[PDB]
């Protein structure tokens, strides 16, 4: 199981910061891309990511996950549609440029959508006056200068097994703010006070390196 | 006061959903852009955002804010530098493509920096396995489908003035998670338990429309 | 109610041979297209037919039909999807370039697809030796030099109402070779001999101009 | 005896679906085309198909057939002219974009013309209202989902030799709709009832795999 | 009756030095050509000279003559074919780039071919050693600096009517070297000594302007 | 000694039909040109013909002749200027686009100018009415179908040495029309009746292959 | 007497900073240049500066001076040649890119040559080590921070008329470093100690605005 | 230690006249640059000199100097900033196009700036009338035909150590016109009469080669 990236932008370069060590195949039609992809220590596959026979050429079936990021949403959607006809199980992460098309990328079959231009534009217009939101996003989601965001799983037979959010007191015990809990494909933001934790649940929250460290300790029993 | 936009992408289009009805002047060299900018109900100024004389031609001095989003960070930086030479007061929001260049846009004189490709790429790599963080960002920062992030100010003569975060009990009172407090240019994420609120402080948090309303009530009168 | 054409090619031009006298609106982004479109006696709408806001600008909702034929299947698919989110009733006729994408075009929401490239290329390989098929296609489906394909509806109170296909004996009476009968969205090619006609049925036949005239009379009053 | 293809499009790619296994020379001047051609399993000769020296380089002389599909009818007509100047015998199959030029493709020398854009354009305009015709052509000339078009010869000493059309009663005996009969270079569509079959005639008809198979038996032995 | 020019090169600008005073319509697709064509006191028609409807648009039927000079031979031919399809009578002067195609221009329907590239290439290799031929062509066919080639008609009731070439003694009486004599469509280069002149014959030969005036006088009245 | 060719048109390719078997080097900057240049059996030198160091690179000093035919007159002139700067003796044959620049190539330092565009334009305007001149240029200077122009040298101790033009009676003895006589750098078109031939003079005239052969014999031995 | 400028660059723009107030015609091929030229307050003529007819359209004849700065030395040379055909008197100032062509620009007819790329590259290579030379040129010929270069003429009835270099002792009297002396068309840098001044001689020297001011005083009255 | 050059122009070509034989590495993104750079005897690094990772790859750290001259002031500035973030010691020589940006190039960290466009344009306006200045610049800074600009160090134990400019009398002794004295980073143009020389001072003068040679000897041992 390996990672396939369709298209190449700064996004997919930043993506290879955390996959550089894993076998990554980049599928793009432009030749000039070969140089850049090999600069990042990834495999390059020359072909058209909108063509079904070329998606297979890059082992899309049986692959760990596919990241789609082409030059228009038109191409991005069409590429997704191709993957779903090749393998309906493989995880698809795709970038959406236009807001209109977030819905389309999902209906094409993308598992998770990323809308960086929708965010950017929204953060711009809000930050005209103040935009403390903007510098939050910049410092937590972009730079992670002091704080980071974490997905921590509750392991089987955890200390928090069957413990309500109220009793768990996660924020004061560990320092991490609890944003929400994830089960399956579903995230419950700001969970009810008496929600009960299970093994396999995902805790999502903001915290510094140490507060995160305390969190991981606080969970295994 | 009016808003000047340098360059044109989907970001700046998405940006105009919120200023649509305000005096917005878009400065770009490409002729094809006039067509789209007039489609969005904004003014068009034909010039080179990197040339100082064209920046003045677009009323950058004494403008409310300038948003900089050009085709490369090279240009973005060069544009900012031109603005800082016309007016060192005017608020500058700029989007950075490469990570290495976030530091540079600040040194050039940008007030708030946005890094959509840094976020996008980082979200991509971590969402290969799970990515509940990814769908959080998607549903609150991008789509605002159920929840939203808010900046509410503490009015002069507030009910919460001189009251600590522990005493304020804002989470249990209103439903809104308090992420941080802004004073001046400084955002304090997860503020000290005994931190004292002042008039003019900005509350940054996540909430549903109703939970937001209860917060607005909870401050004034 | 009018016809909207997304994109411009020789197909969409040949299409105006039969609507030449109707309000046809052509939506395309390339400026060069205007000149050609106005030489055809057609309305031109400048815009991106993959952008929902531009499709609506072209009065796609409540139009007679939308013809989609863009530079790539990628865009053609995307366009269809956008139309389908503006109006799910409007009839969509779309041209597929690649074979793999005929079924993508239907699953996007096009009511009728055409694969001129697939027909053409398949016909090529088959005409290397003989190819009486190719000259059938050319002389009947392209030039209509002597014979034509016809769709003739069986009107209310028709002479043929409730008459069996063998009993009707249309080929020997009229001259027209009956290929199939259409009801609703379903075409029964070579219908069983004991099939009954109803008012509303469509007869699909090959025939000479006089032979077709003879059919129109044998049906009504 | 081998096949020469001048120009590269989705049509010529679809051609090699049926030619894969035989010796094909593809002549175009774009280099990008080498890649797609060798992964299609054909020989590639880089050069200008409108230039006679390059056509000769591509073994047009004494080829089984030459298929011409260039970017404009200008080039396609010029190409055919060249081929006829090298070899006036070789079967020329050429694709006409514009209607006006179908007449010219023949006058230049092409033995059979295909006009995909003309067919497509006409099917579009017709299918606005109903278009059961479109879905016939789609499901028999393109997809061959249930029915196909056949060209079966009458072999030497066949059961049907010297038998009249009415006497042969082919539709009822076999299930196949007889469209026409080919003698020499001409197709007689809907032949007279008393037409006599000869060894060497070609039957052009519509039928399913079983009906087709029944037809081949019905003639020989 | 008026002159129609397809395409635009330096040739066609030089052609206009002697029609400037007549109505000339240049038919080209390039917008840039408009500026140049109006700088010569010539009319501009915007259109595709290989498309028959654009050819008709520019009054090709009933035009005095059509000059065809397009960007490739492929086109020049296609253009000529279109003109011949509108009017089989109209005089066609066509410029030929490749030698291969001098034949094809004539078969397409050109009344006179000009092959400046062929002439030029031959003069090049020829003039490496000597090329006295080269400076003749330069000084008589290009510059006409002292001499020039003449076409002079023999008027009705001419002093030369019925006089043989020997008896007429033209070179010695007038100074004009006779190259040939034209009747109908036939050009006799170096006419035999006993060739008899007729009213309507064209004398073709080289001469200074005084030698030409001498000939004019020597034939008429 | 060898031929150096700056630039590449159909002119230069035609030029090579007569040198094919000589070491000819084509100096051009374009990569596409390599293909075509090696397709004619010529050598490719990659350089900028207007850059003197690249000019030297291609053995311009001490080369038999240099043929200049670049894409604009600005370039052609420039080139000629470098070659003259590298060597004032070397034979330069140069093609002229605009009439304005025939003077400029000669002053730049070209030995013989060819102006096919000027010739072709004049022949166009001329041939609207008649143009028997046109078909002469076509059949004698371009195609040489039955006649051609010759340059025949008078050998040392020729039978014509010291014989006058009248006494030589060349036309009547040989069949060749004499146009002019070449001495040194000077061409005397239509030489006076009493011009005395010398060993080294060049007879320039039009003739059939047999008429030319007759002349060669008539002069020597 | 007005100024014609051929071609547009930052140079010709920097030029108009000192000319704005006088009649300037700018001749350029590119349309985009119009807006920037009228923003600079000079007349713009659209046309080909390498063509005589267009140069005449731009009023080169009897202009005060013509400045030539086209995109290649090729064009600049051709351009100058054209001007010299129109007016052999007009002062031609031209900019040389390549060093090899400075000699060509003069031989073409340019009165003064400026070689900014040659000065630049030369200053780049020297300054690797020290480069106090680089900062002199920058601070005197470019920025004129504290000092600049002067050309003060010696008027009729001059105090210095007939006085020698040693006796005039110009540096000690005025602070101005005497660089050279202009007589006719020729500058004598660092003249003999006993050189005697004349009215109309031009002094070329380096100085501050006060030092320069004293020199003007020092000469007249 | 070696020299790194970012971007390529005739400036950087002229630069290699003085380092031709030294290890020069040229960093540019355009493939086409490769061939030109290797014709100059320099090394080519393929990369984007605005990307920090690519400046690193070019060994910018600890290089002798870095010369920046890119397509636009935007890119030139970005480059300098990248270098200063890699090494804040390395000497940066950069070329500025626009006047506004000379300010910026230094503020980005360039040790020495050159503005060939500013000089050139300034000289143009100045030289419309006379311009002996321009011919100083041309013949001394550009061509160096008779006289050169020089930087000579006063070595340790110099004859001139601690001698004033009045007492040194360098102009009358050696013939070189003393312009300024350089110490550290500062140039004192036209130094005071009684300025004392020190070991390590740089003398900036204008001299003939013998004049300069005479200075080198007057200065040592």
String of DSSP letters for C149-206: EEEEE--TT-TTTT-BHHHH-HHHHHSPEEEEEEETTEEEES--TTPBP-TT-EEEEE
Q: Are C77 and C109 part of one and the same domain? A: yes
Among A191, A193, A8, smallest CA distance to A95 is for A8
Two tokens, residue C16: 């105006």
By Cβ distance, the residue of G114, G115, G133 closest to H204 is G133
Instruction: Look at chain E and report how many structural domains it folds into.
Output: 3
> How many pairs of residues across A and C have Cβ atoms under 8 Å apart?
47
Q: Distance between CA A118 and CA B14 in Å, rounded?
A: 6
Please, which residues 58-77 of chain C have a Cβ atom closer than 8 Å to chain D?
Answer: 64-65, 67, 69
The whole-angstrom distance between H110's CA and the closest CA on chain B is: 15
DSSP states along H32-93: THHHHHHTTT-EEEES-TTSHHHHHHTT-TT-SEEEE--SSHHHHHHHHHHHHHH-SSS-EE
Two tokens, residue E197: 């002149």
Instruction: Label residue D79 exposed, middle or buried (CB < 10 Å: 0-12, 13-18, 19+).
Output: buried
Chain-chain contact of F119 with E137 (C-beta, under 8 angstroms): yes
Helix (H, G, I), strand (E, B) or coil at C208: coil
Q: Are H163 and H61 part of one and the same domain? A: no
Other Cβ atoms within 10 Å of E156 Cβ, number: 9
Is B23 within any annotated ligand binding site?
A: no
Q: Are E161 and E129 part of one and the same domain? A: no
Q: What is the 3-state secondary structure (H, E, C) of C120-155?
A: HHHHHHHCCCCCHHHHHHHHHHHCCCCCEEEEEECC
Two tokens, residue C35: 């000149």
Instruction: Label residue F112 exposed, middle or buried (CB < 10 Å: 0-12, 13-18, 19+).
Output: buried
Q: What is the 3-state secondary structure (H, E, C) of chain G?
A: CCEEEECCCHHHHHHHHHHECECEEEEECCCCHHHHHHCCCCEEEECCCCCHHHHHHCCCCCCCEEEECCCCHHHHHHHHHHHHHHCCCCEEEEECCCCCCHHHHHHHCCCEEECHHHHHHHHHHHCCCCCHHHHHHHHHHHCCCCCEEEEEECCCCCCCCCCEHHHHCHHHHHCCEEEEEEECCEEEECCCCCCECCCCCEEEEEECHHHHHHHHHHHCC
CB G132 within 8 Å of CB H187: yes
Specify the experimental method.
X-ray
Is the torsion defined by CA of F156, F162, F166, F168 positive or negative? negative
Q: Are E191 and E126 part of one and the same domain? A: no
Q: Are E30 and E101 part of one and the same domain? A: yes
Q: Distance between CA G189 and CA H143 in Å, rounded?
A: 15
Helix (H, G, I), strand (E, B) or coil at F165: helix
By Cβ distance, the residue of A72, A81, A107 closest to C104 is A81
Other Cβ atoms within 10 Å of E21 Cβ, number: 8
- In chain H, where does DSSP find H-type helix? 10-15, 33-38, 52-57, 73-86, 102-107, 116-126, 132-136, 165-168, 170-174, 209-218
Long-range contacts, D32-39 (Cβ 8 Å, 24+): D33/D8, D35/A46, D36/D8, D37/D8
- Nearest-5° angle of CA E185, CA E189, CA E194? 100
Chain-chain contact of F132 with E3 (C-beta, under 8 angstroms): no
Q: Does A103 touch chain B (CB under 8 A)?
A: no
Listed residues E145, E161, E187: the one ending a domain: E145
Chain-chain contact of F136 with E112 (C-beta, under 8 angstroms): no
Alpha-carbon radius of gyration of chain H? 20
- Rounded to the nearest 10°, the torsion over CA F76, F82, F87, F89 is 20
CA distances (Å), origin A65, targets A25, A86, B138, D132, E91: 11, 13, 19, 42, 68
What CATH number does residue H132 fall under?
A: 1.20.5.870
Closest-approach residue (CA) in chain F for G108: F108
Q: Are B157 and B82 part of one and the same domain? A: no
Two tokens, residue D174: 């076999």
Q: Beta strand pairing status for C186-189 and C177-183?
A: antiparallel
Instruction: Label residue F37 exposed, middle or buried (CB < 10 Å: 0-12, 13-18, 19+).
Output: buried
CB H158 within 8 Å of CB H219: yes
Beta bridge partners of residue B182, listed in sequence order = B187, B202
Task: Tell me which DSSP letter residue B22 carries.
Answer: B
Mutation target vs E (from D49, D77, D85; most E CBs, 10 A cutoff): D77
Q: What is the 3-state secondary structure (H, E, C) of F75-143?
A: HHHHHHHHHHHHCCCCCEEEECCCHHHHHHHHHHCCCEEECHHHHHHHHHHHCCCCCHHHHHHHHHHHC
Q: Does G209 touch chain H (CB under 8 A)?
A: no
Q: Are A109 and A197 part of one and the same domain? A: no
What CATH number does residue B62 fall under?
A: 3.40.50.720
Two tokens, residue E74: 């492929």
Mutation target vs B (from H52, H71, H78, H105; most B CBs, 10 A cutoff): H78
CA distances (Å), origin F165, targets E170, F149, F178, F221, H7: 17, 19, 10, 19, 68
Q: Are A65 and A22 part of one and the same domain? A: yes
The whole-angstrom distance between E127's CA and the closest CA on chain F is: 7
B chain contacts of residue H104, beta-carbon cutoff 8 Å: 78, 81
Beta bridge partners of residue H186, listed in sequence order = H183
Two tokens, residue D175: 């299930």
C chain contacts of residue A50, beta-carbon cutoff 8 Å: 72-74
Q: Going along E29-176, which residue ranges are E strands?
A: 43-46, 65-68, 92-95, 112-114, 148-153
Biggest distance spanned by C-alpha atoms of chain C: 58
Among B123, B87, B79, smallest CA distance to B105 is for B79
Two tokens, residue H136: 């100083």
Q: Distance between CA G215 and CA G212 in Å, rounded?
A: 5
Q: Which domain holds residue F109?
A: 1-115
Task: Tell me which DSSP letter residue H143 carries.
Answer: S
DSSP states along E26-70: EEES-THHHHHHHTTT-EEEES-TTSHHHHHHTT-TT-SEEEE--
Two tokens, residue C221: 């009053």
What CATH number does residue B188 fall under?
A: 3.30.70.1450
- Nearest-5° angle of CA E21, CA E24, CA E30? 135
Mutation target vs E (from F9, F10, F41, F68; most E CBs, 10 A cutoff): F10
Closest-approach residue (CA) in chain H for G189: H136
Among A193, F155, E74, smallest CA distance to B171 is for A193
Q: Does A104 touch chain C (CB under 8 A)?
A: yes
- The whole-angstrom distance between residue D212's C-alpha and the CA centroid of its chain comes to 19
- Nearest-5° angle of CA A184, CA A186, CA A192? 115
Kindly give, in sequence order, each residue whose CB lies less than 8 Å from that of residue C23, ignoring residues fewer than 6 positions away: C2, C3, C43
CA distances (Å), origin H184, targets G124, G130, G132, H201: 19, 9, 10, 8
CB F180 within 8 Å of CB F204: yes
User: Chains H, E in contact: 3+ Cβ pairs under 8 A?
Assistant: no
Q: Distance between CA E150 and CA E178 in Å, rounded?
A: 9
Residue H168 dihedral angles phi and psi, to the nearest 5°: -70, -40
Q: Distance between CA H93 and CA G133 in Å, rounded?
A: 13
Listed residues G115, G131, G161: the one ending a domain: G115
Q: Does D152 touch chain C (CB under 8 A)?
A: no
Q: Are F110 and F139 part of one and the same domain? A: no
Chain-chain contact of H77 with B72 (C-beta, under 8 angstroms): no
3-state helix, strand, coil in chain C (%, to 5): 40, 25, 40
Among C205, C118, C143, smallest CA distance to C168 is for C205
Q: Distance between CA E115 and CA E103 in Å, rounded?
A: 11
CB D25 within 8 Å of CB D58: yes
Two tokens, residue C95: 């041209």
CB E121 within 8 Å of CB F17: yes
Q: Distance between CA A123 and CA A100 in Å, rounded?
A: 18
User: Chains F, G in contact: 3+ Cβ pairs under 8 A?
Assistant: yes
Two tokens, residue G108: 């073409």
Q: Are H93 and H160 part of one and the same domain? A: no
Q: Are C215 and C169 part of one and the same domain? A: yes
Kindly give, in sequence order, each residue whose CB lies less than 8 Å from that of residue B148, ignoring residues fewer than 6 positions away: B140, B206, B207, B208, B209, B212
CB D68 within 8 Å of CB D13: no
Q: What distance, in Å, lies between the first and last C-alpha atoms of chain F?
A: 30
Chain-chain contact of B67 with A124 (C-beta, under 8 angstroms): yes
Q: Distance between CA A47 and CA A56 in Å, rounded?
A: 10
Q: Are E99 and E121 part of one and the same domain? A: no
Mutation target vs E (from D80, D104, D106; most E CBs, 10 A cutoff): D104
CB C77 within 8 Å of CB A78: yes
- The whole-angstrom distance between residue H204's C-alpha and the CA centroid of its chain comes to 13
Is B211 within any annotated ligand binding site?
A: no
Helix (H, G, I), strand (E, B) or coil at A44: strand
């Amino acid at each position: 199981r390996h990672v396939v990236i369709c298209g190449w932008s700064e996004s997919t370069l930043e993506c290879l910061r955390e996959l550089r060590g894993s076998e990554v195949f980049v599928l793009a039609e432009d030749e000039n891309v070969r140089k850049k992809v090999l600069r990042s220590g990834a495999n390059f596959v020359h072909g058209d990511p909108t063509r079904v026979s070329d998606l297979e050429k890059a082992n899309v079936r049986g692959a760990r996950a596919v990241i789609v990021d082409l030059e228009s949403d038109s191409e991005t959607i069409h590429c997704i549609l191709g993957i779903r006809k090749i393998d309906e199980s493989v995880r698809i992460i795709a970038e959406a440029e236009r807001y209109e098309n977030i819905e389309q990328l999902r209906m094409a079959g993308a598992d998770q959508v990323i809308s960086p231009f929708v965010i950017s534009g929204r953060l711009m217009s809000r930050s005209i006056d103040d935009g403390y939101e903007a510098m939050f996003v910049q410092d937590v989601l972009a730079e992670e200068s002091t704080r980071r965001m974490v997905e921590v799983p509750i392991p089987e037979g955890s200390k928090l097994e069957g413990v309500s959010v109220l009793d768990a007191d996660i924020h004061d015990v560990t320092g991490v703010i609890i944003i929400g809990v994830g089960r399956g494909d579903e995230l419950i933001i700001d969970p009810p006070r008496d929600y009960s934790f299970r093994a396999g649940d995902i805790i999502l929250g903001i915290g510094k390196p140490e507060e995160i460290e305390r969190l991981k300790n606080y969970i295994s029993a």
